Amino acid sequence: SGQRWELALGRFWDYLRWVQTLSEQVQEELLSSQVTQELRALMDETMKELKAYKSELEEQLTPVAEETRARLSKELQAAQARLGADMEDVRGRLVQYRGEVQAMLGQSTEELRVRLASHLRKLRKRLLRDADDLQKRLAVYQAG
């Protein structure tokens, strides 16, 4: 429904989708560290906005028992952490690819790319399921 953190994650998604095409332009930016620097910036923004959103949501909560509340808060924290780790895993996999190409001597990277593409598809599935889980928890977090 358009929170700042969701827009930030949206930027991350848009950039990752482009990286996933693995075109020659992508490959240029991967080999420089520009892609991983960009992903780190987008990741950091998302996390920052997520934490700020949670803090604001806490200004308007339905008062529930409190045992429940401490647990909803812990579960939300866990969900936030998962999103960050997921984004970092994407960046890390790209760092690994750059190292592999740099040790490659001008040889074909096609196989490396086929493997990277398959791996990123699975990393994206994980980040998306966690993002959806995080959103669901946030949406119900005010009530208890």
Side-chain angles (χ1 to χ4, degrees):
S1 261
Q3 298 312 311
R4 296 172 51 127
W5 78 271
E6 296 169 334
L7 295 170
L9 178 59
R11 296 185 287 266
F12 185 94
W13 287 127
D14 284 339
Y15 193 75
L16 173 62
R17 171 163 15 249
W18 170 66
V19 168
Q20 276 188 86
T21 64
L22 294 170
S23 69
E24 174 57 17
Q25 285 84 354
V26 169
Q27 180 81 353
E28 165 76 17
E29 315 264 275
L30 274 172
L31 263 291
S32 71
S33 39
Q34 182 154 195
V35 159
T36 54
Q37 292 177 253
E38 184 61 24
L39 285 166
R40 177 192 199 211
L42 293 169
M43 172 173 350
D44 287 346
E45 183 177 353
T46 303
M47 297 301 291
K48 179 213 300 171
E49 294 295 338
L50 185 58
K51 160 266 313 153
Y53 183 49
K54 174 190 204 291
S55 182
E56 295 186 23
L57 284 180
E58 289 172 355
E59 291 300 316
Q60 302 181 316
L61 299 175
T62 293
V64 292
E66 188 246 46
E67 182 43 32
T68 317
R69 180 55 72 196
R71 93 171 206 128
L72 290 185
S73 182
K74 208 197 175 182
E75 293 184 339
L76 190 51
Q77 193 128 209
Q80 294 170 258
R82 260 159 14 229
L83 193 83
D86 288 347
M87 287 183 283
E88 184 58 54
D89 284 350
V90 170
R91 195 192 69 95
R93 186 51 181 90
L94 296 166
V95 173
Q96 173 192 329
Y97 172 83
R98 185 190 197 226
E100 294 196 71
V101 176
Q102 292 180 150
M104 208 82 250
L105 278 181
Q107 304 160 233
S108 175
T109 60
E110 183 63 25
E111 179 161 4
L112 280 173
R113 288 186 264 116
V114 169
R115 274 56 187 109
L116 173 63
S118 188
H119 206 157
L120 294 175
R121 221 112 47 201
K122 286 173 179 178
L123 296 175
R124 177 211 182 231
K125 291 181 170 202
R126 162 157 58 95
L127 169 63
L128 177 59
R129 75 188 163 85
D130 286 342
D132 285 350
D133 178 60
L134 170 61
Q135 299 174 154
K136 284 180 221 163
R137 293 177 196 275
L138 286 167
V140 326
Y141 183 67
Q142 289 171 277

